[PDB]
Design brief:
Subcellular location (chain B): Cytoplasm; Nucleus
Shape of chain A: globular
Structural class of chain A: mainly alpha
Number of strands of chain A: 0
Largest sheet of chain A: none
Organism (chain B): Homo sapiens (Human)
CATH topology of chain A: Single alpha-helices involved in coiled-coils or other helix-helix interfaces
Helix content of chain A: 55-70%
Protein name (chain B): F-box/WD repeat-containing protein 1A
Oligomer: homodimer
Largest interface: A-B, 37 and 36 residues
Number of domains of chain A: 1
CATH architecture of chain A: Helix non-globular
Order of helices and strands of chain A: HHH
Radius of gyration of chain A: 13 Å
Chain lengths: 52, 51
Amino acid sequence: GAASYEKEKELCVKYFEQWSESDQVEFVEHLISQMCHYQHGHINSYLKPMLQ
Amino acid sequence: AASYEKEKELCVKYFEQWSESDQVEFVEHLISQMCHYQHGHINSYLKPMLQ
């Protein structure tokens, strides 16, 4: 249901917003573990400016 | 969990069917909503995984 992806994404964001700071972290790291090298590159390049 | 574990599992399932670029846009969104401290954990997890 690819026309439903925006709505899926909004629900997941909603669920995520109700979790504790550490479940949130555990979740993002799990997602990261399932992604490929190129995905890892574009999140790193997004995270890096934001650490300062 | 268990509420988090029920919901995390649903989220993971939705995620696995998104395109590689919707996956990235999504994670990037999650991160934009996080602590400087959460960011430090993510960075620490991600940096060894690069090389």
